[PDB]
């Protein structure tokens, strides 16, 4: 069945899933730049772009 | 934090105090310009009349 | 032995550091027979978080 | 003489301003037979069984 | 002397226009300000360098 899955394989699958969840997130957070807020919504904070 | 609440079934609409009191659209208020700027459209609509 | 593919270690992300997103399942009840549309922020094209 | 009177409703409804200029001196709504005659009850506006 | 009146600097000067609203200039903001204070002086003294 295409709509179905075998339960005894659940853990195996979930595990591998988490493994990719990690692999796919292995990056360094890069810094971009800002601009001061020209409105009064915030007290002149620096919003990242 | 000047959240406004609409009047239901005849009751008058009300805006929130600085003290945390909901008052009706009448009397003498004190608004720092900013407030209007942040909510130009909404305030214009609710208060004008 | 002479030359093994070298792994790609350094990678950068300029976007948001999140893996969860909030999604709409059932649309809002607007317009409706009780709350006048002039109440909802969405009616003023206000962008929400 | 022209009078501007509200439509009675049978369910919670938001509220909104209304500017009037003419009212009578004594009851004159005896012409009224019934409101929301087919609903279980009139919640806002003149209620008359 | 000027810039110190729109940003938070520890330069001792008499502030006479503090009643005129102003945000707390960020480096970026202050900079552009300076550029005017700059060009205005140049064009006033006929400087081109």
Curated annotation (Swiss-Prot), chain B:
Homodecamer; each decamer is made up of two conformers of VP2, called VP2A and VP2B. 12 homodecamers assemble to form an icosahedral capsid. Interacts with protein mu-NS; in viral inclusions. This is Inner capsid protein lambda-1. The gene is L3. Belongs to the orthoreovirus lambda-1 protein family. It is found in: Virion. It comes from the Viruses. Inner capsid protein that self-assembles to form an icosahedral capsid with a T=2 symmetry, which consists of 120 copies of VP2, with channels at each of its five-fold vertices. This capsid constitutes the innermost concentric layer of the viral mature particle. Displays NTPase, RNA 5'-triphosphatase (RTPase) and RNA helicase activities. Helicase activity might be involved in unwinding or reannealing dsRNA during RNA synthesis. RTPase enzymatic activity represents the first step in RNA capping, which yields a 5'-diphosphorylated plus-strand RNA.
Curated annotation (Swiss-Prot), chain D:
It comes from the Viruses. It is found in: Virion. Inner capsid protein that self-assembles to form an icosahedral capsid with a T=2 symmetry, which consists of 120 copies of VP2, with channels at each of its five-fold vertices. This capsid constitutes the innermost concentric layer of the viral mature particle. Homodecamer; each decamer is made up of two conformers of VP2, called VP2A and VP2B. 12 homodecamers assemble to form an icosahedral capsid. Interacts with protein mu-NS; in viral inclusions. Belongs to the orthoreovirus lambda-1 protein family. This is Inner capsid protein lambda-1.
């Amino acid at each position: 069945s295409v709509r179905g899955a075998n339960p005894l394989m659940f853990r195996a699958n979930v595990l591998h899933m988490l493994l990719e969840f990690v692999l796919d997130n292995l990056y360094l957070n890069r810094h971009t730049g800002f601009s001061q807020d020209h409105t009064p919504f915030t007290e002149g904070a620096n919003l990242r772009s | 934090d000047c959240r406004i609440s609409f009047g239901m079934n005849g009751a008058a609409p009300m805006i929130r105090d600085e003290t945390g009191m909901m008052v009706p659209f009448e009397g003498n208020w004190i608004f720092p310009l900013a407030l209007w700027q942040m909510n130009t459209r909404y305030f214009n609509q609710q208060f004008d009349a | 032995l002479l030359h093994a593919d070298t792994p790609r270690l350094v990678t950068w992300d300029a976007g948001l550091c999140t893996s969860f997103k909030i999604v709409p399942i059932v649309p809002a009840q607007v317009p409706q027979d009780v709350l006048a549309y002039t109440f909802f922020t969405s009616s003023y094209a206000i962008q929400s978080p | 003489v022209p009078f501007m009177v509200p439509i009675s409703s049978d369910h919670d409804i938001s509220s909104a301003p209304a500017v009037q200029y003419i009212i009578s001196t004594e009851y004159n709504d005896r012409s009224l037979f019934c409101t929301n005659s087919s609903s279980p009850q009139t919640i806002a506006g003149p209620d008359k069984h | 002397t000027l810039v110190a009146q729109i940003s938070e600097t520890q330069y001792p000067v008499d502030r006479y226009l503090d009643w005129i609203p102003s945000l707390r200039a960020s480096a970026a903001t202050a900079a552009t300000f300076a550029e005017w204070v700059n060009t205005s002086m140049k064009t006033a003294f006929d400087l081109s360098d």
